Design a protein around this ligand. Structure first.
Ligand code: CA
Ligand code: CA
Ligand code: NI
Ligand code: NI
Ligand code: NI
Ligand code: NI
Ligand code: NI
Ligand code: NI
Ligand code: NI
Ligand code: NI
Ligand code: NI
Lengths: 325, 322
């Protein structure tokens, strides 16, 4: 009645925000049974994102005895690619000392070949459809893999999904896609593959919880917060998250963003504590045109848009989770 | 015996690897001060990182505390702005926010704020009982100031000056619309300062130019080696810094990240790491396309042929110290 863990799959695209989300899920086995991860070649190069996924899985397996799980590289291709400079992060993370602990390298080298054989889209479909319990899918990259599953399997897939918790969009606030060919109204995850986003968000047979910029822009990650990880440096997960957040805040200074934001980590937070935000049912359009507003998600089935997330609850959740090991 | 050393640096990842190498080897090096210049960093951030590393090593291995001074030297030609934020980033890293180190630095910072960096360099060298080796990993401005103000009263107490700078027989690395690519950054930042120091017969200069440094790349396969040593704070520090460095050269399309400043400190620890060629240099101090160039023309001693294996061994041994 409150004592069972949720069955979860992480469908991610391999950047620092995606891995904070991953750590949040995997560090909390009382609440979350992580049965698979999918990596997409969007905010990463897929080979690097795959390797970092595998190292984190192996480290947690060693330290807290969380189960191993299948990991699959999606063959989904971009409609609009992420900026090249942004996609090298997973490569950089795979050189970090906390991801090269000798036992973790040894176990991942052993498990990598069996996971190499997986097709990411098909793995998502298979894990959901064979599962005894309904599955929560946490989507922190684009919606291409979910769209593929709906297209190929329809209700045979959707009837086994509990809900889809998604990072994407911008409803009542500005977007973050700033290119010579865009108007700044779209958000990146949607812009990467707008028709996929439309297929998923408009499907009445899947419940979508949407963390758009409306919510995620209210949870900045600042220097004063990043520096809190030093007090917990004895824990591997605090080394990892501290480092990743430090790297992220630096990126936003270099890119002249107002701030770095929790972004993807909020989807995972919601799965762990669904009172962290309130939900507004909203009908959305998804702009799939080739105009300046491609990928826009303006107000127009109801999508459930996360509103007003608790900064304090998020902070408490991240700091407790990163003391797990 | 230990050599008495000062580090005159400008606050980026290569400077801090050099610092770690010096400070982790008290049997060989007595580090009596550090100077930070507002060149490849913003000086306030470079100052704070210097302090935190000092405090961490004091805590872990009981190395002495020492004065740290911010130089007020100003750039002739500033480093690219986007490169200068590294020290700020490092000061957010968890290995530099261990609570005891933060606390000790908050106590010691105000006493060091009073120091003028140029004057501190002069004062430390001139009051030292032994002759001092100055390890210069940023621009030559502070050494030039000391020579200008105090002349032989200063230089007569310098054992030798070990400097990161120049490119003699190879191309440079200063790529701007107003340059030809023949000059190296440390020299370009302040060419007249470099000319004053390199051309002074009364100071013995050991010069690590791109000729030497570009033969000692830092590659992924190497950086990953720090994982085996992650229980050591210095390995978390150097591993992370080199990971960050190799990333920067990917983004910037460099052929590789290079040891750079870390080789000067390596040389102080093991002088057989490289051979030395005596060479007369010119320093181009004009405003032309070749500003800052150090072409063959007193003899400067140019490092040649540094041992990659010795360097690797030294860095890995040093980062298992704590
Ligand atoms: Ca993502
Ligand atoms: Ca330097
Ligand atoms: Ni229950
Ligand atoms: Ni992201
Ligand atoms: Ni399989
Ligand atoms: Ni707190
Ligand atoms: Ni440098
Ligand atoms: Ni003490
Ligand atoms: Ni003093
Ligand atoms: Ni490139
Ligand atoms: Ni080795």
């Amino acid at each position: 009645g409150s004592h069972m863990a949720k069955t979860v799959i992480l469908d991610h695209d391999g950047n620092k925000d995606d891995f904070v989300a991953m750590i949040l899920l995997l560090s909390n086995p009382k609440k979350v049974n992580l049965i698979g991860c999918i990596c997409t070649d969007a905010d990463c190069f897929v080979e690097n994102g795959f390797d970092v996924t595998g190292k984190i899985m192996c480290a947690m397996h060693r330290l807290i005895k969380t189960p191993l799980f299948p990991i699959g590289k999606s063959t989904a291709t971009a409609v609009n690619a992420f900026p090249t400079e942004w996609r090298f992060s997973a490569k950089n993370l795979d050189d970090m000392p906390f991801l090269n602990i000798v036992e973790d390298v040894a176990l991942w080298e052993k498990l990598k070949p069996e996971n190499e054989a997986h097709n990411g889209q098909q793995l998502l479909a298979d894990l959901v459809m064979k599962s005894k319990e309904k599955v929560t899918v946490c989507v922190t990259g684009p919606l291409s893999n979910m769209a593929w599953c709906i297209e190929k399997y329809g209700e045979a897939f959707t009837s086994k999904v509990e809900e889809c918790v998604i990072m994407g969009g911008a409803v009542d606030v500005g977007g973050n896609v700033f290119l010579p060919t865009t108007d700044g109204s779209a958000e990146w995850n949607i812009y990467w593959d707008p028709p996929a986003a439309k297929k998923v968000l408009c499907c009445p047979n899947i419940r979508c919880v949407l963390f758009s910029l409306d919510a995620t822009n209210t949870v900045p990650v600042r220097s004063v917060d990043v520096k809190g990880f030093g007090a917990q440096n004895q824990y591997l997960l605090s080394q990892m998250v501290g480092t990743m957040w430090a790297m992220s805040t630096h990126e936003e200074i270099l890119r002249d963003g107002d701030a770095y934001y929790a972004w993807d980590a909020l989807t995972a937070a919601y799965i762990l504590e669904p009172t962290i935000a309130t939900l507004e049912p909203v009908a959305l359009d998804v702009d799939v045109s080739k105009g300046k507003s491609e990928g826009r998600t303006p107000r127009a089935p109801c999508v459930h848009v996360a509103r007003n997330p608790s900064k304090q609850m998020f902070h408490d959740l991240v700091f407790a989770s990163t003391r797990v090991c």
